[PDB]
Swiss-Prot record:
Cellular component GO terms held in the UniProt record: extracellular region
Record-given protein name: Enterotoxin type C-3
Main location: secreted
SS bonds (residue pairs): C93-C99
Species: Staphylococcus aureus
Protein family membership: Belongs to the staphylococcal/streptococcal toxin family.
Entry coiled-coil feature ranges: none
InterPro entries: Enterotoxin, Staph/Strept_toxin_CS, Staph_tox_OB, SuperAg_toxin_C, Superantigen_bac, Toxin_b-grasp_Staph/Strep, Toxin_bac
Alphabetical list of Pfam families matching this protein: Stap_Strp_tox_C, Stap_Strp_toxin
Keywords: Disulfide bond, Enterotoxin, Metal-binding, Secreted, Signal, Superantigen, Toxin, Virulence, Zinc
Amino acid sequence: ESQPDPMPDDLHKSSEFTGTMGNMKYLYDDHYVSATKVKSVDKFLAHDLIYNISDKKLKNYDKVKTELLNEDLAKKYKDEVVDVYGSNYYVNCYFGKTCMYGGITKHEGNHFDNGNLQNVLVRVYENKRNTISFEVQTDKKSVTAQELDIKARNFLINKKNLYEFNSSPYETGYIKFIENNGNTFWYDMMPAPGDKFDQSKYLMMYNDNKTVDSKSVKIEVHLTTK
Ligand SMILES: [Zn+2]
């Protein structure tokens, strides 16, 4: 059922991407859509949903379209009261508007009990050594892996310069989720080889709206230096 771990050539190398890393940095550096108790208002394609969500911050949008893996996922959350969490983009976002993928969890029943926040531990591995470990927080029992990944990359951009404008001090990176039923999966942290980064295509991995149990999930960040 599990994703086999990275083989050595499954991982994007940053020295083979000659476009602008600030373009990856932007997707994770104090960057996210957040909405709570929202119900979808519209649809573009069969596998997406559109919500009246404004960024209260720098006022860039009052409508978020989220794209899912398929029509069934879309149908399923269409008339549900939901919280949204995800990384938005504007390039080739077509439908005051912004785009994203997945980020969707039902609101009813999905929160801890004394309004507590749950800590999820991230263990960071640099050239196969556990050098730093940190906690990220959510208030959702079933939280998207996108949410947690966003929060862990945000922290790593600050502490570790994970992504910089021109480069990354890292060659390879992957984030790995280990669920308490043994299931593992992982995302490639580095952009595809070449001179142009396509945010929309990068983010599209979050399509499947994967959620995990926040209280028992384990996250590992595996990085290798230049
Ligand atoms: Zn909620």
